[PDB]
Amino acid sequence: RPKIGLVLSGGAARGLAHIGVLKALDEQGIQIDAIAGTSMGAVVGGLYASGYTPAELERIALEMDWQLGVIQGQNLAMVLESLLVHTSDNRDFDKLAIPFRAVSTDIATGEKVVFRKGHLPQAIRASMSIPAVFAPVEIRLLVDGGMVDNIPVDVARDMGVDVVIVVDIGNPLRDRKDLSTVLDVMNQSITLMTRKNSEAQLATLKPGDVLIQPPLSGYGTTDFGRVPQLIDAGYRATTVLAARLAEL
Amino acid sequence: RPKIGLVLSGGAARGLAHIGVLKALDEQGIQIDAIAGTSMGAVVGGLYASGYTPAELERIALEMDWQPLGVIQGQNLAMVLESLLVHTSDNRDFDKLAIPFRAVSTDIATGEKVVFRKGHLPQAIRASMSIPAVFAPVEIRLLVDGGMVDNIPVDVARDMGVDVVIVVDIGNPLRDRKDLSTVLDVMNQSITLMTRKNSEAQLATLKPGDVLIQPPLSGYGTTDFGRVPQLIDAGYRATTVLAARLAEL
């Protein structure tokens, strides 16, 4: 039987669609041997790697307050430590329920930083440290890994997997009418280079592999008003490929 | 004889080294048939394309004040450029300037490269120079600094039909850990990162025939205009050193 690696692309609000993919994949009895994730893909995939069920991930997403950069940085770190209190005495990420890699960016040098050991919470928090939303973290000064490897196919392949299931939740560009402020222009820039490394990795997909691309046409990148829809989106997108995933 | 295209990479303060390259190139009698530039490379190269001498470019750089806010500086930069270029008002096609010229910019809405080849020289150069968080973007497409898509526009210059390119890379140094204080700092760094990545890509396409000039700018702050004379000397000396290699064009 083939080793299957699950790659979970970066985002924020949009990355809760990852939950619905897991929910489908589990239902369909697809066994994941390795997970690689950036930002939200790293949160969802990390919690799942640690032992959470997609159903519990769903319950947690529907029951918490998504309603300055440093204060939110600490708040995110304390939530992650609470959820992961059961993996305190873990150090090697290969020895979690499922092997797991988070991906982050060394803001000083631009180098990709793949975590494979240490403190799961702290590593996941690095991968999730979106500039102008969560302060970077010091472990190297570290940020959201979207700008270097948003869809870390190659990371997952260096865990020795034969096939990858890749979930691209997309990073839509802002429309001309929404580019009001200077912050808006620069996020757009980050979005542009994020897509460019994303497209590059997606280029390396082979015959064997499976791309999942949830229908998220409507969906605001930071908009957590529609969780149930986001999760359904990933659920349905994956349910549709039940036939193709079956042959793994 | 070969058609020589001069490519002038993007920057800000560091791009005044471009002046010293022109100053050398002229001295050495190297004839330029086409110019392509981004940001500062576009200002210096555009003014030179229009008929300024490198000497006058140097005089202008040594005698002016580099000492809601993004927009006010945007207008100020536009009025300076219109003053300097008042003689090319009735120009429309950039191929009919003293030297053919292309400025390069970025459509911030779509990420597409925007190469200007016609219209109003000042307005186009101002687009190429519209560095986010320093000069408001311009509406012509909402347009910014072309560094993020083609900082070293070798391919633009080659689409003007040149056989050889002289490329001036002034570099975009990354900020060190100790200088990354604010959120603005982190995001500039990001822009720097993608700027280098497209820069390295174009530099990859250079051939046997072509000539890369890379001024010694080790010290130099990207926004630091306190050392103009050094910046110009840097480009001057870097080019003077290759007098032999440029001679065979």
Ligand code: NA
């Ligand atoms: Na340390």
Ligand code: NA
């Ligand atoms: Na550090």
